[PDB]
Structure formats: structure tokens, C-alpha cells
Amino acid sequence: PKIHYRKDYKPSGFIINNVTLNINIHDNETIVRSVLDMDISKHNVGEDLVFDGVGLKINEISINNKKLVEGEEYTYDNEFLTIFSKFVPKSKFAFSSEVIIHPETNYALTGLYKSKNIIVSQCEATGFRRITFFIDRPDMMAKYDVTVTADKEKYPVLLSNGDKVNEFEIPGGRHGARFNDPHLKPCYLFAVVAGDLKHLSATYITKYTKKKVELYVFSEEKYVSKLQWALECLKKSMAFDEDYFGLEYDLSRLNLVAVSDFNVGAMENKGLNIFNANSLLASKKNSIDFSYARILTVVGHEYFHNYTGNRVTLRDWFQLTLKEGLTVHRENLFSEEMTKTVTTRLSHVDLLRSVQFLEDSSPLSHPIRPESYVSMENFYTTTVYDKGSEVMRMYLTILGEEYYKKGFDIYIKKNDGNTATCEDFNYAMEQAYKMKKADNSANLNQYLLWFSQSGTPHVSFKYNYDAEKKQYSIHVNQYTKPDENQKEKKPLFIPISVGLINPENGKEMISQTTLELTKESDTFVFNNIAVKPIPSLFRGFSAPVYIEDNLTDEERILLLKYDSDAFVRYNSCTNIYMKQILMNYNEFLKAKNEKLESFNLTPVNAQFIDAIKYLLEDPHADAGFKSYIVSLPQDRYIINFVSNLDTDVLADTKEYIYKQIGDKLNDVYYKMFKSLEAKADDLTYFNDESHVDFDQMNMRTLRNTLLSLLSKAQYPNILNEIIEHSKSPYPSNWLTSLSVSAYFDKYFELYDKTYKLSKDDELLLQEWLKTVSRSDRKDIYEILKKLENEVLKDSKNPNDIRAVYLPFTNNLRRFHDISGKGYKLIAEVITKTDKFNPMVATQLCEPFKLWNKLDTKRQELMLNEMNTMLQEPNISNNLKEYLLRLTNKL
Numbered sequence: 001p002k003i004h005y006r007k008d009y010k011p012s013g014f015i016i017n018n019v020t021l022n023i024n025i026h027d028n029e030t031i032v033r034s035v036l037d038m039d040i041s042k043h044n045v046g047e048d049l050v051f052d053g054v055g056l057k058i059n060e061i062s063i064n065n066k067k068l069v070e071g072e073e074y075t076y077d078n079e080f081l082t083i084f085s086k087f088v089p090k091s092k093f094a095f096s097s098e099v100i101i102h103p104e105t106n107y108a109l110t111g112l113y114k115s116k117n118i119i120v121s122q123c124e125a126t127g128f129r130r131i132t133f134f135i136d137r138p139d140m141m142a143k144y145d146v147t148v149t150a151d152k153e154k155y156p157v158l159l160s161n162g163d164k165v166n167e168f169e170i171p172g173g174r175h176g177a178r179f180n181d182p183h184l185k186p187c188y189l190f191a192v193v194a195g196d197l198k199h200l201s202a203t204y205i206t207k208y209t210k211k212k213v214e215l216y217v218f219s220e221e222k223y224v225s226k227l228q229w230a231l232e233c234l235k236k237s238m239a240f241d242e243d244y245f246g247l248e249y250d251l252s253r254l255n256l257v258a259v260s261d262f263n264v265g266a267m268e269n270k271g272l273n274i275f276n277a278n279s280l281l282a283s284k285k286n287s288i289d290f291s292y293a294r295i296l297t298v299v300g301h302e303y304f305h306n307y308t309g310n311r312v313t314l315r316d317w318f319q320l321t322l323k324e325g326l327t328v329h330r331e332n333l334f335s336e337e338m339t340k341t342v343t344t345r346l347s348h349v350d351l352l353r354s355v356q357f358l359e360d361s362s363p364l365s366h367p368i369r370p371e372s373y374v375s376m377e378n379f380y381t382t383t384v385y386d387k388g389s390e391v392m393r394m395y396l397t398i399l400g401e402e403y404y405k406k407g408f409d410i411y412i413k414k415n416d417g418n419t420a421t422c423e424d425f426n427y428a429m430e431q432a433y434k435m436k437k438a439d440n441s442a443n444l445n446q447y448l449l450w451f452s453q454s455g456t457p458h459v460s461f462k463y464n465y466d467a468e469k470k471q472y473s474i475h476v477n478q479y480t481k482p483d484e485n486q487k488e489k490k491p492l493f494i495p496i497s498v499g500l501i502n503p504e505n506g507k508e509m510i511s512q513t514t515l516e517l518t519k520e521s522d523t524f525v526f527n528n529i530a531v532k533p534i535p536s537l538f539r540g541f542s543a544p545v546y547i548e549d550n551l552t553d554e555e556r557i558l559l560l561k562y563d564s565d566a567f568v569r570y571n572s573c574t575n576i577y578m579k580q581i582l583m584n585y586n587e588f589l590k591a592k593n594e595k596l597e598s599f600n601l602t603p604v605n606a607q608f609i610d611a612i613k614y615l616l617e618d619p620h621a622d623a624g625f626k627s628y629i630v631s632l633p634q635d636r637y638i639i640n641f642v643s644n645l646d647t648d649v650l651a652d653t654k655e656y657i658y659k660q661i662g663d664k665l666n667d668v669y670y671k672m673f674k675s676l677e678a679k680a681d682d683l684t685y686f687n688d689e690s691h692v693d694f695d696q697m698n699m700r701t702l703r704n705t706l707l708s709l710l711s712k713a714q715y716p717n718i719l720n721e722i723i724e725h726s727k728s729p730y731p732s733n734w735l736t737s738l739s740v741s742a743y744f745d746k747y748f749e750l751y752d753k754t755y756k757l758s759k760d761d762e763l764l765l766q767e768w769l770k771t772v773s774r775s776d777r778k779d780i781y782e783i784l785k786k787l788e789n790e791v792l793k794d795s796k797n798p799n800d801i802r803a804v805y806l807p808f809t810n811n812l813r814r815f816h817d818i819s820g821k822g823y824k825l826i827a828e829v830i831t832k833t834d835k836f837n838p839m840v841a842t843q844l845c846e847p848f849k850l851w852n853k854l855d856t857k858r859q860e861l862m863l864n865e866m867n868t869m870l871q872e873p874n875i876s877n878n879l880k881e882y883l884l885r886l887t888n889k890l
């Protein structure tokens with residue numbers, strides 16, 4: 001394969017200053033005429049001029065009006081257009097091409113493609129080269145003048161980046177629109193849209209300069225009623241960047257556009273943000289609760305890129321975390337502020353510790369700044385986004401608010417209108433650090449290891465209390481396991497937010513403080529500590545690490561009950577569960593392996609169960625937080641602690657633990673499920689798409705969690721509750737009634753009922769597909785066949801494909817069937833999908849990431865399927881790279 005290395009970065013021998021496009025859309029072809037106003041850089045050594053250009057049909061090539069001819073002045077191999085250096089001018093020149101492309105047959109959804117009846121582009125990372133010739137890398141910044149033409153009846157709305165400067169009629173029922181984007185940009189931020197779109201709009205006045213900005217949100221006509229919440233979230237995003245960071249929008253107009261067929265969630269094209277419809281569109285009667293948080297996050301995120309990615313862009317793709325980690329962090333600040341619920345932070349931690357930690361101990365492990373790639377699209381990873389975001393957040397922890405804002409300002413001001421690197425950001429933070437320490441010899445050189453070193457650190461603790469001196473010490477050790485990226489790992493700069501809880505009264509004993517661990521180990525001593533404390537460690541999840549608290553379960557229960565920090569309470573609970581899961585897992589495993597006729601299981605700690613009940617009944621604990629305490633740790637979290645994991649032994653373990661707790665708490669669960677009803681399902685705001693009560697939504701989450709526990713338990717007469725729940729006007733409730741009905745005969749009637757409620761809204765039908773896919777049914781394989789034949793059919797919509805298959809891959813007992821049939825099913829879908837959409841095919845490989853953590857029969861079965869996929873003729877470079885890396889071949 002063809003490998004790009006970070007260390008090999010060099011500036012181009014060329015400059016592209018201006019790009020002038022005409023995109024002429026017809027039914028069976030799109031003609032793209034492009035003039036590049038180019039020049040020779042100071043790095044030029046008389047080399048050939050080589051453009052990226054993939055799958056393009058050439059009509060004509062010229063330089064300065066001289067026609068160039070294939071085989072004589074240029075060569076084109078379907079990937080690269082080479083202009084021989086003899087025909088490359090030595091000063092400013094104009095390069096003209098005209099090519100033909102075919103959005104209508106573009107099912108990979110990269111470059112220019114048709115989604116239903118909308119023509120749309122996706123250019124990040126390397127899709128601009130599928131539209132026209134370019135030096136398609138983010139340091140080649142240029143200004144763009146873009147004209148689009150199309151049939152007027154079919155494509156009445158024409159959009160590109162920036163100010164619309166002309167609109168005109170064209171003979172034969174066509175029309176055109178011209179755009180000028182005055183901000184220098186890389187080609188990955190180009191976008192065009194043509195469709196029969198409807199919109200909502202509002203005017204926003206900026207806080208500091210009072211500039212009038214026109215805000216437009218667009219969709220197909222059928223779903224214009226689903227646009228309001230996105231618009232409100234855009235307003236909130238703008239306000240937040242103005243209020244927290246002092247950053248105002250920089251164009252007269254910002255368009256957001258929903259399309260049905262999209263590979264990811266959204267894209268930050270300057271002034272023209274394009275979204276998966278599932279991440280822009282919602283209505284309270286036709287969307288599950290989670291859509292509202294999703295839209296808030298995705299709108300905010302793409303908005304925040306306007307500075308962190310757009311106004312300050314990437315020198316090269318290896319710097320990807322500089323925009324993505326930083327923008328995830330910005331959005332996390334925003335969402336925490338908007339929702340005001342601890343579940344926002346917990347959900348982000350839950351994701352990191354399950355999905356990202358699994359990736360970081362897999363053969364796919366990479367640092368947040370990768371050293372190499374074949375397809376850059378494979379490095380849009382939880383490591384780069386989510387571990388990146390935690391690395392970006394640690395600066396805030398280390399500096400505090402005041403100095404963090406100063407360092408961010410240095411960064412944004414210095415590099416505005418330009419490219420940047422991770423080093424530039426660290427340099428800006430280092431300036432704030434020197435100010436904060438009042439010391440110009442302080443530096444953040446060590447901090448750079450968070451960019452270059454892979455793997456999750458392990459942080460462990462020992463404690464000592466001297467009652468005569470009233471003095472308490474916390475001894476801390478850090479360790480990162482060697483891996484294929486570094487055979488020798490170094491200590492990181494690890495900020496450890498801490499408090500100290502008096503176990504006797506449950507109260508705080510110190511002002512919150514942050515320990516700065518910079519060595520392999522260190523001892524932190526506290527004086528005037530009146531009694532032996534229970535330490536509250538990594539408050540707020542203050543670094544992206546495995547925490548080994550060395551606490552007893554009795555200490556953990558006390559933190560769960562009385563600590564102030566939501567993360568530490570949740571983590572304490574998590575650790576109690578993990579101790580139990582490992583112990584019972586080992587017990588079941590020994591019984592299976594030794595073929596024992598009888599054996600013991602360690603019961604769940606009864607004091608822990610009492611502590612669960614106490615929290616559940618506390619009316620001033622967050623309902624969202626409660627739903628995390630009654631749920632066991634995610635399977636992908638648990639697997640990081642087990643080698644050679646037998647998935648059926650784990651499933652048996654989880655079932656035991658849940659049954660143990662339910663046997664004690666099911667009446668409490670039922671009583672809470674009924675007592676929460678009035679507030680949970682209150683219809684305040686049901687017609688208001690500009691206000692969302694996130695607390696109320698967490699109450700519904702908790703009811704629906706409780707109902708699932710009670711259903712699995714076959715609690716007496718719970719079927720009546722499930723039937724009544726199916727009558728709720730909230731989709732979150734009536735779809736939960738379908739999942740929870742899995743344990744009863746009524747499942748297929750609920751399946752039909754909810755199908756009928758879902759089938760006329762494309763996005764709600766996809767939520768119904770997911771609900772079916774993740775149903776706890778012994779007959780799930782037959783149900784998947786039914787969905788394939790009756791609903792999915794031949795769809796190439798990535799949302800449909802993901803909905804049918806991915807939730808199912810989280811069915812521990814069924815997807816991991818020892819026959820290997822679950823691995824064969826998903827492998828066939830991956831290979832199928834790879835023939836038209838390589839990015840989606842790689843997304844579908846997710847469940848294989850943990851292959852080398854499984855018992856050796858399952859490792860063999862997964863491996864067999866991965867190697868079979870790898871043997872497929874014409875496998876994409878995306879899929880081939882992914883699979884070779886995942887299987888220790890690359």
C-alpha cells in the first residue's frame with residue numbers, strides 16, 4: 001500500500017491563489033470547468049506539476065490558453081494528472097480544465113453526489129479531487145469564485161460557500177447562481193448544494209460589532225417542520241462563542257442543510273454546513289429524545305469549527321486532532337453549559353472509556369497525532385476526536401479559566417487566516433502557563449507527549465494517614481504499556497483533580513485542588529487533615545487514564561453516597577461493579593472449563609445494593625445520574641479488563657448480577673417507575689421546538705431503564721405497563737415499549753404497531769430499525785432476515801444499513817454466537833457495502849476491533865472472516881488499510 005508519513009511533510013513547490021469554478025449540472029452528467037490562478041513557491045525546484053484528480057473524464061486541459069495534450073504535455077492515470085515541467089510556467093499562470101463527473105452514480109458519497117433529489121458535495125478529506133483537479137491538501141489555501149447552473153424546476157435552490165453575487169436565467173429552463181467566498185480556505189471546506197429545498201430563517205445580530213447575520217436552515221419539503229430546533233441550537237452556538245470566547249461569525253449568511261444520504265454526522269464547510277438529516281432534523285412527535293442532544297452537539301460542533309478548523313486550519317492531515325479534538329472540547333463546554341446536567345459529561349466519559357480505551361489497547365492504537373496513513377478517512381477516530389478532546393480539556397484544568405482563555409486567544413489571534421500545527425497550540429498554552437506560574441522558565445515540553453505517545457496511562461494510588469501529625473499522603477504511580485508505536489513509554493503530565501471526604505460525616509475536608517503528576521511516581525502530602533479521609537480522585541475525570549483507586553468497596557459506597565463530584569460517585573459505582581464482574585466472571589469460567597457439577601458465586605455486596613436504593617429514593621439526585629447507577633458498565637469497558645474474554649461467560653455474569661440486584665430492588669424500581677410518570681411525561685413544550693427540558697428527558701431515560709430491568713425480570717403484571725407505555729405520545733417511550741416487549745409474546749404485535757407509527761418519517765423508521773436490531777430476542781437472526789427482505793431491501797442509504805446491523809453487533813450473546821454466524825453475517829455486509837461505499841464498509845467493521853481480546857475460538861472465527869474480507873478482489877484502500885492494521889499486518 002501507498003503510505004504518507006508525518007515526518008515527510010514539506011511545503012508545495014506551487015501556490016494556488018484563486019479558484020474559479022462553473023458547475024453545470026444536467027440529468028446524466030455534470031460538467032465542471034475550473035480555472036486555477038497559480039504561481040511558483042519559494043520551494044519550487046523545477047518539478048513536474050502534479051494534480052490530484054480521481055475518476056474525472058477530461059474534456060480539456062490548458063495553461064495560459066495553450067491546449068495540453070495527453071502523452072505529450074501531460075499524463076493522467078485516473079488518480080494524478082502530471083504536467084511535465086517543461087510546460088509549467090516559471091511565474092504566475094492560469095491552469096484551465098474541464099471535466100465530466102456523475103453525481104447521479106456516485107454512491108460513495110464523497111465528492112459530488114445525489115442524495116434523493118438533492119445534489120450535494122462532501123470534500124473532507126480527499127473528496128475535492130473527485131470534483132476537479134487540485135493539489136488536494138489543506139495547506140493549499142485559495143479564494144473561491146463558484147457558479148452553479150441547473151434545471152430550475154428540479155433545482156430551484158443553488159448554494160455555495162460565501163456571498164451570493166448574481167442569479168440569472170439561462171435558456172432551456174435552466175438557471176445559475178454565483179458565489180464569492182472572501183475567506184482563504186483549503187479545498188476540503190468547499191461545498192455546493194442544488195435542490196428543491198425549503199427553509200426557515202432568522203436574523204442574528206452579533207454581540208460586539210452588531211453585524212446582521214442571516215441564518216438559514218434547509219431540508220426537503222416533506223421535513224421543513226423538523227428544522228426549528230437546529231436553528232435555535234445555531235443561535236445558542238453563536239451566543240456561546242461570543243460570550244465565552246469572544247468570537248463572532250464572519251460572513252453575512254450561514255446556511256445549514258440536511259441531506260438524507262451522508263457518511264458521517266455533519267461537515268463544517270464555510271458558511272454552508274451540511275448535515276446527515278439525523279443530526280439536523282427533529283420533531284417531538286417524530287423523534288426520540290436523544291435527537292435533541294445530538295442536534296445540539298452537531299450544530300454546535302460544526303459552528304465552532306468556524307474558528308477552530310476554518311479561520312485557523314490544518315497544515316497537514318496529521319494535525320487533524322488540532323481541529324477535531326479542540327472542537328469536540330469546545331462543543332463539550334457548550335453542551336455542559338446548555339444542558340446543565342451531569343449526564344452530559346458522564347456520557348462523554350462513558351464513550352471514551354468504552355470505545356476509545358478499547359481502540360487504544362487494540363492493534364489499531366495510535367497517538368492523537370498519527371505518524372502515518374494510507375487513507376486519511378481511517379483516522380477520523382475516537383482517539384483523535386475523544387482522547388483529543390480530553391487532551392484539549394486538560395489545558396483548561398491545568399491553567400484554569402482565566403489563563404486558558406488567554407492561551408486560546410493567543411492561538412486564535414496568531415494563526416488567524418492561516419494553517420497551524422499541534423505545536424502552535426501547545427506554544428500558545430505554554431505562554432499562558434509561563435504567565436500563570438509567574439516564571440518564564442516553565443514550559444510544556446512534556447505535554448507534547450500527549451500528542452505523540454499512544455496508549456492509555458494507568459494511574460494507581462497508595463494512602464497513608466498519621467493521626468498524631470494530622471498528615472495524609474497520596475502516593476501516585478503512572479504506567480503506560482509499551483506497544484507498536486513506542487517500545488519505551490514516558491511519563492505524561494497528568495493533572496489529578498482531588499478532594500477529600502470525611503467518612504464519618506460525609507463532608508469535604510479541603511478546597512478542591514489539582515495535583516500535577518509529571519514523574520513516574522510522586523507523593524503528595526496534606527497537612528491539617530483532621531481524620532483519615534476517603535480520597536475523591538480524578539474529579540470530573542481530569543485526565544484520560546485507567547484509574548486504580550485502591551479503595552475498598554466500603555470506601556467506594558461512601559463516596560457514591562456522599563461525594564460532591566458526579567464523576568467520582570459514578571466511578572466508585574463502576575469500580576464496585578467491575579470487582580463483582582471480574583470475580584463472578586472467573587467463577588463461571590472455572591466452572592465451564594473444569595466442567596463442574598456445582599460451584600459458588602460471590603453475591604453482590606448487600607451494602608452496595610442498599611446504597612443504590614438510597615440514591616434511587618433521593619429526590620435531589622439527577623435522574624440521569626440514577627440511570628447510570630442501575631446499569632452495569634458497558635461491555636466494551638469491561639473487555640479492557642479481561643484477556644481471552646469468553647462472551648457467553650460474560651453474558652451469564654451480567655445476568656447474575658442484574659438478577660441479584662433486582663431480587664432486592666424490583667419493588668423500588670416499580671414504585672419509582674410509577675412515581676416518575678407525571679413529571680416525566682408532562683407535555684409542557686410538546687409543541688415548542690425551541691425549548692427542551694433536559695432534566696425531563698433524563699427522567700424519561702430513567703423510566704425506560706427501570707422498565708427494561710422490570711421486563712427482563714418478568715415483574716408481575718409488567719406487560720400491562722408496557723402496553724400502556726406503547727400509547728405514549730413520546731417516541732422514546734413507545735419505542736422502548738417495543739424493546740422491552742422482547743421478553744413477552746406481545747413482541748410481534750408491538751413490532752407491527754410501532755412499524756406503522758414509524759414508517760412515514762424516514763428518520764423515525766431508522767430509529768425503529770435500530771430498536772428492532774438491538775432487541776433481546778432469541779430469534780434475532782430471523783428478525784434481521786425479515787428486516788433485510790421487508791424494509792432495508794437494496795437501500796444504499798448509510799443510515800438504513802447502519803440501523804439494521806450495528807445495534808445487533810452489540811448483542812453479546814447472539815452476535816458472538818460460537819458458530820461464528822454473527823461474524824459471517826457482518827463480514828458479508830461489509831464486503832457488499834465496500835463495492836459502493838468504502839467509508840461505510842469500514843464503519844461496519846467496528847465489532848471486529850476487539851478480536852484479539854476474545855477467547856481463542858472467537859479470535860479464530862473473527863480472524864478467518866477478516867482475512868476472507870482482505871482476499872476480496874477490488875477491496876478499497878480504506879477497508880484494506882483498516883483490516884491490515886487491525887490484523888497486525890501493517
Ligand SMILES: CC(C)C[C@H](NC(=O)[C@@H](O)[C@H](N)Cc1ccccc1)C(=O)NO
Pocket residue numbers: 124125264265266267268297298301302305324328377380385
Ligand atoms: C463529533 C461530531 C459532533 C460530529 C462529527 N463531525 C465532524 O467532526 C465534522 O466536523 C468532520 N469535519 C466531518 C468528517 C469529514 C471527513 C471524515 C469524517 C468526518 C461526525 O460527523 N460524527 O458522525
Ligand SMILES: [Mg+2]
Pocket residue numbers: 054055056057100101102
Ligand atoms: Mg467519474
Ligand SMILES: [Mg+2]
Pocket residue numbers: 762797
Ligand atoms: Mg430512503
Ligand SMILES: [Zn+2]
Pocket residue numbers: 301302305323324327
Ligand atoms: Zn469536526
